[model samples]
Target: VGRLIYTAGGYFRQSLSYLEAYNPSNGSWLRLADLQVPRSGLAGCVVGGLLYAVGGRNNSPDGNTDSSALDCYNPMTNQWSPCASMSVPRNRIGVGVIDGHIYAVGGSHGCIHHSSVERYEPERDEWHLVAPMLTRRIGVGVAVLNRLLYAVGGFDGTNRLNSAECYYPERNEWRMITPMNTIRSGAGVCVLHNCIYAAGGYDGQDQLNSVERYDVETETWTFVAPMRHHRSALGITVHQGKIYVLGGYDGHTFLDSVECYDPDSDTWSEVTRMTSGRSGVGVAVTMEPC
Candidate 1:
């Protein structure tokens, strides 16, 4: 993780390839290199100082044109180059980085939900199948804690899920964890202080503003201060001891709004919004270029 928060392609009026980086130090956004392929709902991650923008889809609300594309951005060159794409085209991919590799978890294949999992080998710019999730999911909230990947609530095609599971990479297995109090298909999730926090997402019936925290040792899911706005498909990460959630859809608008969570006081406050609205934006944290 680094000092900058970069967000890429997302849904505005249509799928976009625009890329911008937010500097928390001065709260300014600097537009960066754009993706070659326009898309939305991409899963973004940073490994070895290079940013990776993963799978997503095109304009149609139903995802008529899904992409299996993988675009990598190097801040050093200020350029984006295509890399090996995934086998399946989908959006809302739950992504986690472990052992210097990115684990692209359960996401949809257009209208079809999936349980398949794949991992990227950066050294070779390749991806291959891994132990898949037991449940077919989309819009899953993913977090990396103690080197273990946790897959939280998401849509199962049939319903919004309150269920949670953890992936043991070494063992190549997944085990079910305690279910969240509320179902969340597009929750903004991250690990803070050894605890997993699940925030703002839809319950299928409605968009939500609720937040939940899961303590590993205690194995309990507790309530936390909720966000001011209902959001899902939001990007979240731990930055300088606080959790920052960026652009997401609130069911009505492609939101540019931002909110910060302070675990010390369990409070959330509005922050500088993005220059433009974006939903399903690819967000990744990378080091400041020297």
Candidate 2:
């Protein structure tokens, strides 16, 4: 019922704005339209049948200057349109969607990390500030589960953080949660079967292949089988009851390898690799409307 979508990311030579779609049924990639602006260190989410490319920078010094750019793509028409810019420019941002509204969370601008978060109301074409996070971060992993938004590990401006927290929109408050077993930045995270999964990332010292799952009921994290290759900045999505982790970097090399985890078995297996190596990629899985 869903397909995987991968967007802009960084390569060895430069950042990119390409878009690609993967069909798990046939295991083939369909190259789609390119992005209006090429960028990396960005984040994305699906809201109201549209895919949004949020704050990110190109690979140059001046590239990050206009990090507030908000680009939206419509799958029905295969077109791109610019939306209202965010309140502040950010890179390595975390994003999630709730009740058709998109939220852009903690990230950094230049050397300064941000705790501030913003929400986009598509019907009004506007953005507004939301409650800030407890800690400033960049490359944090974000996911939506049980009507709550969870913010996971990232670089906290000073150190690689293992901290975790969640925001409740109804109360407009943020509450801390149990930290992961290990510190991670640029990790790929997604929710499947009402459970949150955190995949490969950099631990300040090296790339990691470790994987963990968060049980919402218990609010605790548990280790699962790790991916075959260590990665950071990869794209992750849940499709047909499985968790797929896409391209990213492994410290020494850019990776095209793809892997998936089966919650029922708690096992990781390799999938088809992407055509090109990518780091800091944005990924989303299409959802059917209720």
Candidate 3:
């Protein structure tokens, strides 16, 4: 597709907008059609040109609530429709698709961090609970490459984490990967050039500007260029060979600035910012052409 679409975390207020798409070519922002039900920290993935939005806090940020409803949006028509909901309402979970099915993993429900795992099979139009995760956490980074789902660092409830885990759908098993160099919450992870990139997030004490790369083949992590601003609770995605970082909180304030990382130069540069500041939003790039 010609543009990247995103969902804003409406935690603070229903004031949050449903969706926004950016055209990478001209660097222009175009607000997309809205979501039927607006929610923040919802998990999402793009499969076969359809954007599926699922599970997030349901109430206004002031109230702090949770909802398990699932919804889908069509960029072709710019409309949203409700779908089968999840068994549990989750926020900050890693979501990715494999073989046209969606997987949701690791998020907090109020009192505890859940390792509960679930999947959606489009053919049956139903939800299925699979094996649970090895660790209970929230705000973990998740990326799908080669049909394997990797869950990165996040909060274990008491402190930030450097622990990373993976799930093999074929075996229905979980394995621990290399721990992150930094233990932090609210980090962003995406796949680029066959490598897993762990981007900006908070490291317990302060917001972070550092970025790391995990080579799946080697099973090792290497530090990459850092973000321009020290931020956490941000959303990041790779589209058309470029990495985009958006909507983060800097401990003191929320951010709307958008930045891009170019692998060719191994450098990060700020791009046009969003219309409003948002934190804990779900982000993904569309594969189809605009």
Candidate 4:
């Protein structure tokens, strides 16, 4: 089995460059080298055994001023180095990897939500624009399911959204899917057993602990067990048949607590907490041969 890795920090006030790895077997955390840039609202995904940190803001809340910087992390060496930047600056983007290539989905450029999409070719160290989404969004939850990319709820410039969409890479096209029942942004999302699970997020006015799952075959979304804590900007990944959600904010304070949901039981239980509180944290499950 491999370890679960978390990268960077979250939120402007708590932004950090430091990264850490978690050993589930021993319930321990080991701090690793820091990121080249200290910022939040970024998205991360693993491709070819390396973690790629994409577009985000640099502690700023201004309009259309997000960063396009892309930094890569090598777990073997525990080091981070600069990579090619994105085509446009963005924050709160959705990132996923498919067939060894990286995809950066919709996000905001400052106050404006974006529908633009881009793909990264690591072999060439370059990024190229792909088919855009039908709706613009920021803080959307994205994951790859059955070889297709699914982009979930987020905030548009004017309202919180429940709209969901999918990108078919083969055709280089995007299509709107069944929307979630609740509006949210910055939710932690992951896929297990062909179903997509979306956990805690901000619903325009308050943080949410509610969870939902989307079945690809049925083309429907249904409510599942809610998490113990209401979290926005939480990081989530599937490990050993369980979904692990870590570190987020509940509107009042940053969180260090972690929780795991078992799809087989449809229940959520608290797990060991992180060493420090974080929101907008990046998480990846290492599949490299150990």
Candidate 5:
């Protein structure tokens, strides 16, 4: 089995990779196309055959302002086209799709953490406003379960957060979930066996190695597997019941390592490392069978 791929880097300084297929049987990385427009901190998800890349910092935080560009990539055509711009120009935001609607959650704008939320319709290439989060945050982690969207820890203007919350799309409401034990931001999340796993981010003090598992049925959080090293802004996704985490900043340097988590055994293994060193990349799975 293979998966859709996503990544982030300096918009102009470094190019991002796409369309790569990971051969589960052989564990090899095949080269792919460069993103049409370069962006960092982009969050992407695959829905059906289309892979949507959401907003991110278009340039260095020290240089250009954040961007609201939304684009979708078609693997079949090997081409990229622009999608509607998000209502809010936010970067470092958390994004995920529940059912068919895409949710662009909290992020930073103008050096301040934002609480704004936007919903995107791919077919119409339009964005609609959604209920804002309880707390204004950036660099958060998000996942969907049973049609509910869960938003995890992020940095407020002042400090890293320990809070977590969920959004109900049907009700158009948001409620607080159990806060993370570790106060961190920029972590990655995915669903496997119906459970949510939050892994690798930066706490206010330093980078983190802690990962937490949440049970949606019981509404409980458990400290289970941790990554081999501390990372912030890692890319994470689940494919074939296994969770894959790749490329993040470890406080001092960007990383290229890839790690996988097996829920059945509750263990983690070092997988094939990424060829590019980056933070704030994205991951999406392909439709073909594994």
Candidate 6:
């Protein structure tokens, strides 16, 4: 369990190497080590006490420079070093960690969406291909639940999806789960209160403020209290029992505001804002000492 919320490897105009960690306890943002690559649309997660920054393309004016590079951060050393790169150059990816192994899920290689999945073993420092998702997705959100990895709604090139799926490690297979109530691509998803919760994102037509919860027992998704603002591609993570959603785009305007959701109250409240506005930010929790 961790209270530190790590956010973003972004570029509004171009890719940036900036990485920051937000502490909920003292309400302070700590500037951490910069990334090795100036990767745009990258995704990140914590695995085996290290922070891994996955696939994101390097936007260049001269030529196309994409990356499948996997760079990890050491909390004790305050440095980021390369581990192993993903097979495909990707962006808009979803990442999750389970059983001390890291999984890189659906992402895009330019306009084309990928159904590919890869697993990274810390012991070997290598990435191995795994069973792909049923639907090719971009801007997907993934979460680990009770040792099971869940891949939720995302854009499938043509449309925002309401579809959902879960992966079983033992069998190395993916099975379709009950679909979501609304179509959401770039939705922030995580497991809390023993239920899967998906927050605001683009709904094909426009940005959304709606939130939904999935019950594993019944295998159904239902609407929950909506957020104050429509946020698409926001960074979200659970900290101290509450869900914290960071800055994101709201169709017309980009937001710097942060919102906190209390499961006990079933409501969202404006907590704090970031130093600057950002969207399509990667969010992860790290228990390592800083």
Better of 1 and 4 by TM-score: 1
How do all models score by TM-score?
0.96, 0.95, 0.93, 0.94, 0.92, 0.95
The regions of model 1 sitting more than 4 angstroms off are: 60-63
Candidate 5 per-residue lDDT over residues 1-290, each given as its tens digit:
14544443322244343435555556877655566666677788776677777877766435655768787767676666788899777788788897677899888777768888999887677899989999987988989888888899888788888898999887889999888778879988877777778897888778888888789887887888788878898888887788888878887777878888888888888888777667877677764322
TM-score of 1: 0.96
In terms of lDDT, the poorest run of 10 residues in model 5 is 6-15
Identify the superior model by TM-score, candidate 1 or candidate 2.
Answer: 1
lDDT: worst 10-residue window of model 1: 57-66
- Number of the top candidate by TM-score? 1
The digit string of per-residue lDDT tens for model 2 on 113-200 reads 9999999999999999999999888999999997899999999889998888999999999999999998999999889886788898
Cα deviation of 167, candidate 3, in Å: 0.8
Q: What would the per-residue lDDT of candidate 3 be over residues 154-264, giving only the tens digit for each residue?
A: 887787889888889889998999988888678888888879888888787888989998898898899988888888878888777888888788877788888899999
Q: Which candidate leads in lDDT?
A: 1
- Which residue pairs show backbone clashes in model 3? 1-288, 1-289, 1-290, 2-290, 11-61
Q: Identify the superior model by TM-score, candidate 4 or candidate 5.
A: 4
Model 2 compared with the native: what TM-score? 0.95
- What is candidate 4's lDDT per residue for 82-122, written digit by digit as tens? 99999888888889888889889887775678999999999
Q: Cα RMSD (Å) between model 6 and the true structure?
A: 1.6
The TM-score between candidate 6 and the true structure equals: 0.95
Segments in model 5 whose C-alpha atoms lie over 4 Å from true places: 1-21, 60-62, 288-290
Residue pairs clashing in model 2 are none
